Amino acid sequence: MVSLPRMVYPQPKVLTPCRKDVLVVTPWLAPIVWEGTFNIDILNEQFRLQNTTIGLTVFAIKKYVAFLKLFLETAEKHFMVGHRVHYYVFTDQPAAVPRVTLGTGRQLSVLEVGRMEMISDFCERRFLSEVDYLVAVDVDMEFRDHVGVEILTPLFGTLHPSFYGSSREAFTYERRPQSQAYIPKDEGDFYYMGAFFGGSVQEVQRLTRACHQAMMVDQANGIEAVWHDESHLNKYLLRHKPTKVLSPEYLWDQQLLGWPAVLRKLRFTAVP
Amino acid sequence: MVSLPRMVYPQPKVLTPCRKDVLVVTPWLAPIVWEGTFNIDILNEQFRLQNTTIGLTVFAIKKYVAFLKLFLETAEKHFMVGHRVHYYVFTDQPAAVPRVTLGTGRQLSVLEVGRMEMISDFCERRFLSEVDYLVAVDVDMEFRDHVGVEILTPLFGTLHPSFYGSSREAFTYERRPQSQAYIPKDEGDFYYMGAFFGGSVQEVQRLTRACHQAMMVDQANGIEAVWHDESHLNKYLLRHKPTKVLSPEYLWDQQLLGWPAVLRKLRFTAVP
């Protein structure tokens, strides 16, 4: 709504593509986010002028509480820096949550538990009032480079690092027709990983509510989808196309997959 | 909101870009629409499921009423075919509007006049109720190929065919600091043409209301911007970035500019 200020930056040239090596837009005209496709300064302005608050939801259960210190400390270094961030840590051990020092405008809530349910059901009203966007990630990860407002959009998925070069026949979708998550062999755009997705609060409540109900249906029929909540996420994102797709720069494992030349940055990676 | 049906189409491959010759995304992550970037079948489904109505506004004044027959007849062949379309023809000669036969779900209103004002002021309430998107074009044009729902977005501009290969210093922006349309030599992404823009009703009313007020201010100071309403449009789109940019496939003149290889389709062109 509100007008951008004067800014100086390099002229985008229509006859010089920045990336020639990768697909940067999906067939339904959603950006695929790769280094070199965005000007972070333009994007930071747009989102700052809107006073954007980003929620990051993370689950730290049993032994996984050991990963929170490095998770949060690297998040403070690299995640949405300059913007308002609210961390929601779902844990069974509230007293084992490390004391991490947070930048200004950043806050942390510890929520005790006894996942798709948790985001959609219990914390329905709360998320609606406190944040503009919600991002859900796994805790056994660390930020290594910039992850910012370029990712933000009504609904996004992230390309699974094992499958970005594969044919759809190789994707590990649910292949049993009796599951709600069933996808035939001739369907599918991408294989999305369940460890990094988000969007606006409304699109995430919708997504998690849909996956939760479909998992309940599978449960009544005594069937469990091959990759659990990831299988249902892939089904949802097939039928409701994400408005941005994150490249595997946003979800990598260097130990297992090295560092191919297509990745100019490794932003968010598995912990040894 | 509503779910897409099963569809069969070629798998988008992340490591095979479709266009390597042109920029297909802006630095603020808006698609630039070129042939080969979109799957029209996916897009037609998304927009049909929403029951989308598109308004096309056109001004046919004095001698320009001579262009309406070819304009409307080629529009019936190529513009948003399969979707609900409402033409609004603003004219000083209602009786000279040709009788053109329209496809099902398509309608035409003739509105008498004595442009940025007309779209923003008089027809404020009307457009809000009747259509989801509004597109404004010049009448001295004809459709030669597909122009469809790929263009639709909250706010779009179109690249001026004379300037898509130019540096920003060459753009014919308003350069006098006394004009509201003033853009310094080191600012500017693109030169947008005033003959083809649109978006959702709300974003267009906003845009035309802003340009109208800025033109009134220039008028009080006895200044008229070098390219009139186009100068102000460029200023608005500098400060409020469009969410899609149309390539010069959507606005060409073959007589003046030929047919370079970058253009795989000429969709909407000047009349000899």
The DSSP-derived string for chain A is: -PPPPP---PPP-TTS-S-SSS--B-TTSPBEE-TTS--HHHHHHHHHHTT-EEEEEEEE-GGGGGGHHHHHHHHHHHBSTTSEEEEEEEES-GGGS------TTEEEEEEE---HHHHHTTTHHHHHHH-SEEEEEESSEEE-S-B-GGG-SSEEEEB-TTTTTS-GGGS--B--TTSTTB--TT--S--B-TTEEEEEHHHHHHHHHHHHHHHHHHHHTT---TTTHHHHHHHHHHHS--SEEE-GGGSB-HHHH---TT-S---EEE--
Distance CA A58, CA A143 (A): 14
Q: Which two tokens stand for residue A223?
A: 């069937």
CA Rg, chain B, in Å?
19
- How many structural domains does chain A have? 1
Q: How far apart are CA B100 and CA B76, in angstroms?
A: 9
Q: What CA–CA distances, in Å, run from A92 to A60, A95, A98, A109, A113?
A: 7, 9, 14, 13, 5
Q: Tell me, what amino acid is at A25?
A: V
Name the residue among A181, A176, A87 with its Cα closest to residue A136. A87
Q: A244 has which bridge partners?
A: A156
- Where does residue A258 fall: left (phi above 0), alpha (psi -120 to 50 degrees), or beta otherwise? left
The H or E element spanning position B45 is: helix B40-49
**A89, A68 contact by CB (below 8 A):** yes
**Smallest Cβ distance to B239: which of A4, A24, A25?**
A4
Radius of gyration of chain A (CA): 19
Angle between helices B229-239 and B201-220 (to 10 degrees): 120
State whether residue B158 is helix, strand or coil.
strand
List of residues 6+ apart from B53 with CB closer than 8 A: B83, B84, B85, B86, B130, B131, B132, B133
Angle at which helix A201-220 crosses helix A229-239, to 10 degrees, equals 120
Residue B76 has phi, psi (to 5 degrees) of: -65, -30
Report how far apart the first and last C-alpha atoms of chain A are (Å, whole number).
44
Compute the nearest-CA separation of A183 from chain B (Å): 9
> How far is Cα A149 from Cα A80, in angstroms, rounded to an integer?
6
DSSP B77: H
User: What distance in Å separates the CA atoms of residue A239 and residue B6, rounded to the nearest whole number?
Assistant: 8
The C-alpha atoms of residue A259 and residue A265 are separated, in whole angstroms, by 9
Give the start-end residues of each E strand in chain B. Answer: 32-33, 53-60, 84-91, 106-112, 133-138, 141-143, 155-158, 196-200, 244-246, 268-270
Catalytic residue among A76, A142, A150, A230: A230
Residue A138 annotated in ligand binding: yes
The answer to whether A185 touches A178, Cβ cutoff 8 Å, is: no
C-alpha B63/C-alpha B67 separation (Å) is 8
B/e letters for A36-65, b = 16+ CB within 10 Å, e = fewer, are ebbbeebbbbbbeeeebbbbbbbbbeeebb
Instruction: Measure the CA–CA gap between A28 and B47, rounded to whole angstroms.
Output: 11
CB B22 within 8 A of CB B32: yes
Query: Could you tell me which residues come within 8 angstroms of residue B132 by beta carbon, excluding any fewer than 6 positions away?
Result: B50, B52, B53, B54, B200, B201
What does the DSSP assignment read for B171-237?
S--B--TTSTTB--TT--S--B-TTEEEEEHHHHHHHHHHHHHHHHHHHHTT---TTTHHHHHHHHH
Asked if B156 contacts B207 with a C-beta cutoff of 8 angstroms, the reply is: no
Q: What is the CATH number of the domain that holds B271?
A: 3.90.550.10
Cβ-proximal residues to A168 (8 Å cutoff; 6+ apart), any chain: A185, A186, A187, A188, B11
In sequence order, the β-bridge partners of residue A87 are A56, A108
Whether residue B230 lies in the annotated active site: yes
Q: Are A127 and A50 in contact (CB under 8 A)?
A: no
B23 CB contacts (<8 Å, ≥6 apart)?
A12, A13, A14, A15, A16, A17, A18, B32
Q: Please answer yes or no on whether A23 and B12 come within 8 Å at the CB atom.
A: yes
Contact B23 A16 (CB under 8 A): yes
Q: By three-state DSSP, how is residue B5 classified?
A: coil
B132: which 2 tokens?
């989801």
CB pairs under 8 A between A and B: 134
Last residue before each gap in chain B (C to N over 2.5 A):
114
| Residue A61 marked as a ligand binder | yes
Q: DSSP string spanning A137-181?
A: EESSEEE-S-B-GGG-SSEEEEB-TTTTTS-GGGS--B--TTSTT
The pair of three-digit structure tokens given for residue A229, joined into one six-digit string? 């909540």
For A27, the token pair is 């067939």
Q: Which of A18, A25, A154, A185 is nearest to B39 (CA)?
A: A25
Which of A18, A29, A153 should one mutate to test binding to chain B, selecting the residue with the greatest count of B CBs within 10 A? Answer: A29
Chain breaks in chain A (C to N over 2.5 A) after: 114
Q: Rounded to an integer, what distance in angstroms lies between the CA atom of residue B149 and that of residue A146? A: 34
> Inter-chain contact A17–B13, Cβ cutoff 8 Å?
no
Task: With beta carbons less than 8 A apart as the criterion, state whether B253 and B268 touch.
Answer: no
What's the token pair of residue B142?
A: 């004809």
Q: Which domain holds residue A231?
A: 1-272
In angstroms, the CA A204 to CA A124 distance is 10
Give the gap in angstroms from C-alpha B197 to the nearest C-alpha of chain A.
Answer: 18
Q: CA separation (Å) from B131 to B43, B79, B85, B109, B134?
A: 18, 15, 8, 13, 7
Q: Which residues contact A112 (CB under 8 A, 6 or more apart)?
A: A91, A92, A94
Which amino acid would we find at residue A231? Answer: S
Give B103's DSSP letter.
-
**Could B28 and A19 be called an inter-chain contact, meaning their C-beta atoms sit closer than 8 Å?**
no
Chain A: residue nearest B206 by CA? A1
Burial of B56 from C-beta contacts in 10 A (0-12 / 13-18 / 19+): buried
Query: For tokens 């798709």, what's the residue?
Result: A116
